[PDB]
Design a protein around this nucleic acid. Sequence first.
RNA 1: GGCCGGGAACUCAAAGGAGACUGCCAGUGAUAAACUGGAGGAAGGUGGGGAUGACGUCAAGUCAUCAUGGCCCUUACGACCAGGGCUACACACGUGCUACAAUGGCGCAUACAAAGAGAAGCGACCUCGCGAGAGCAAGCGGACCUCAUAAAGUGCGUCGUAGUCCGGAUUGGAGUCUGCAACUCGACUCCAUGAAGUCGGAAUCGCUAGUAAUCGUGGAUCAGAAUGCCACGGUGAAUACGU
Lengths: 100, 152, 127, 98, 83, 115
Amino acid sequence: AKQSMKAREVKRVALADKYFAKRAELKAIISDVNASDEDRWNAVLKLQTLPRDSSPSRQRNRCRQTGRPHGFLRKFGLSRIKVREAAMRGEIPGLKKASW
Amino acid sequence: PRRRVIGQRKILPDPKFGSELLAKFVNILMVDGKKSTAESIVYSALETLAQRSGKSELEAFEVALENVRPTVEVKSRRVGGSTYQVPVEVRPVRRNALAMRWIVEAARKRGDKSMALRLANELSDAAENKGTAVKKREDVHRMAEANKAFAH
Amino acid sequence: NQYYGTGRRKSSAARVFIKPGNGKIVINQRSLEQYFGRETARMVVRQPLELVDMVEKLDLYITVKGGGISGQAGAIRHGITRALMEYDESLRSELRKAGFVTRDARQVERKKVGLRKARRRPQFSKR
Amino acid sequence: RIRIRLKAFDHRLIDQATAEIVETAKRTGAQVRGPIPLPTRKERFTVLISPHVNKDARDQYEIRTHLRLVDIVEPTEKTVDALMRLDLAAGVDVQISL
Amino acid sequence: PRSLKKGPFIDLHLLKKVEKAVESGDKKPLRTWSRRSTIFPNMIGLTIAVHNGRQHVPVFVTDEMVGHKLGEFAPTRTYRGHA
Amino acid sequence: ARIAGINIPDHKHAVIALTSIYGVGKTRSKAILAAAGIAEDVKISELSEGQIDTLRDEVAKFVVEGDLRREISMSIKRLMDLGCYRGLRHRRGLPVRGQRTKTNARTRKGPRKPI
RNA sequence: GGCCGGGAACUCAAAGGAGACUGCCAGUGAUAAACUGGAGGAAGGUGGGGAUGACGUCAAGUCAUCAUGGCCCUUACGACCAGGGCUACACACGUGCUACAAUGGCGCAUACAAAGAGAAGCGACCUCGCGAGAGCAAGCGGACCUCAUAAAGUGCGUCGUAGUCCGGAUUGGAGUCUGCAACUCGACUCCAUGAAGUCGGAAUCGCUAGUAAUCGUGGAUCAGAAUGCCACGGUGAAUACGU
Ligand SMILES: [Mg+2]
Ligand SMILES: [Mg+2]
Ligand SMILES: [Mg+2]
Ligand SMILES: [Mg+2]
Ligand SMILES: [Mg+2]
Ligand SMILES: [Mg+2]
Ligand SMILES: [Mg+2]
Ligand SMILES: [Mg+2]
Ligand SMILES: [Mg+2]
Ligand SMILES: [Mg+2]
Ligand SMILES: [Mg+2]
Ligand SMILES: [Mg+2]
Ligand SMILES: [Mg+2]
Ligand SMILES: [Mg+2]
Ligand SMILES: [Mg+2]
Ligand SMILES: [Mg+2]
């Protein structure tokens, strides 16, 4: 894909793992049942302050080589085309054509 | 088919009568692969008919069977746009198949409350030539009677 | 001594023990009628011992696993026939002539890519 | 008492590894139970083989994982020390627990 | 929708603007792009121009509008009819 | 068999018959009978005036018939008068709950209107 | 309570072997190739299923997976952000799901599978809630723990042919969960409502056996979002004279 998309993905990963702990603590405060609704209101208002790119839900899986955003497989980290290409040359250990 | 390779497949006897023909009837009556329902239905109907007749299930079923089975049918044969209706004989196994199929299809089209009652009433009627199945047999016989000029 | 037998059918496997006795039949620590509510299964189980007529002259201890109802009944047939062979060899031709000895190898076919089922195809239109 | 679990994508390599492990353990003096074969794992994948459209053209692939267990009873202090130093072949995952 | 134990949802900048407007008299209409923000009773009598995608539609908050969201009063599709 | 202003059948069981009230479903009917000690499979025909009175008093605990119609009418009128998205969808006679419109949507549009 | 002591017989697991070869018998045949039948055997003539696609055709599809000749833009045809749209709606077609019921709907009780996944994960037990769920919290990197009671079936009772105790579209009210954020535009729960539909014109599709038909279960994608796709078992038919 375009280089811009790859840059955006890298930046999103950086922001997410930079703000992970603070997001965790604020979300833990909000999710609690034994608390003060004023504290919950303050925590809600504070959670919006962070940049939107710090959410892990803002990241899209992509091929490690080409950047294709469709057809991903979590086990290998590649889309279908590159999986087949590499697998046909014996570069993925233990993988072979199936028949049963 | 073009090859003529098939043979014939084995059929199991019925549960509590030791008859193959009743098993074939149950198979004809079965839907969706639910054989237990069909066998219970046919058993109930046969029991009711035996009670209302007194002979047995076996020969009562047989007597209804001679009254519906055919003896000659027609086959089409295209010549020049129209078709010859050539009459040909029927093998006994096909006689039984056609009789059972006509019986079941006639019984399925009725207005009683249960399928067992439908089947019992229809087959009791057919035992003495009053149902729609015997009417279909008569129509087939008449149509085969008309076109015997082409029976070589 | 107990005579052993093993039967397999569809996805069901059964093991059978036969000894001299007064006609008791036990399946999975239950009676014959308790295990199989279906009558066809009962005649299926009892066919072999009835062909040779040692129903009340033997005692049968059977267990089953896997599959459904008819598969378990067929496995029971196979096991009892093999145990009867192991108990007496003069009966082999008699049970072979009835088809009891052949092992039924019919399995379920796999689903194939592009088809709704093993053989059913999707609906096709010319235009 | 020792549990040892071996994992491999290929059965020949893991069989040779199990043989050398059990022979080394037995030459020390301890007794062995096994090897016991655990169920093999099969993982399957199905992918499209065309860059664009053509839905019904696909390939199917399989990965197999073989796993076996060996038990060491009455271990000697020399047995375990010879056990770590065996340096099993690459491609075989070894787990040792006590 | 929004779980009861979490309360409503409002935007901090919008809340700040609303308070600063209310405490200083009924000023000019307030431009906003926040359409996911629910309506509070403090908003009654105000005029808020909500973005719809291309322009800013003025909404005059009344007592009946409390509870819903702003975007409900700014349609985003234009349709007159067919043929 | 004269409850809340309607005639209910007499050849039916209690639970089935009581659903004829606009505002009473199966669960509410079961709860109503369970609060008055009448067996579910007992017809309206075999009941004494005291029993019908007890049923009427139980049914009076709920909003039924004309009041429910007035409620629904007032709510839908409120929606149409606000001018919200749901109000416009009510005005237009089009799906309200985000269903697809390119096709289907016949139970809300009606029979096809050709060109 | 295979629960314990125990046993390596049995199911099973996974490595290594045997086995099926027109091998034997009879007949036809041109002594040939081969064909029809029989014995033994778990299996008989390619036992069943999958993988495996010759030389080429259609200037067939893909410059948006990627790679690349030539052309084109460079304060923009490149870059960043918020909001919206891809979800519209007089209409026409393709592929599906659910029905129009008594071989059925509903209530109570009880049998029998296979295959698969699990660490920013699967999550028991106990308590609260009618419910989706919430609180506390073992075990598991797994033939050990969790997912996770299989459904159709069976026995008993009711409904007795009615647009119904069939059908579940649309609509109102009150909520749960994921997620910064459910208006446009998520899934799910509860109460209320109860539309067309009584088997479908001219036409037209699939299937030769564990197949069609019917009943359930799992996985990839995935914060959440399957009636689609890819897999797994239960029950289990009719017919093939012929070209
Ligand atoms: Mg690039
Ligand atoms: Mg995503
Ligand atoms: Mg596993
Ligand atoms: Mg033979
Ligand atoms: Mg032979
Ligand atoms: Mg072209
Ligand atoms: Mg081309
Ligand atoms: Mg083109
Ligand atoms: Mg292009
Ligand atoms: Mg944007
Ligand atoms: Mg689209
Ligand atoms: Mg219903
Ligand atoms: Mg009807
Ligand atoms: Mg309801
Ligand atoms: Mg074929
Ligand atoms: Mg299946």
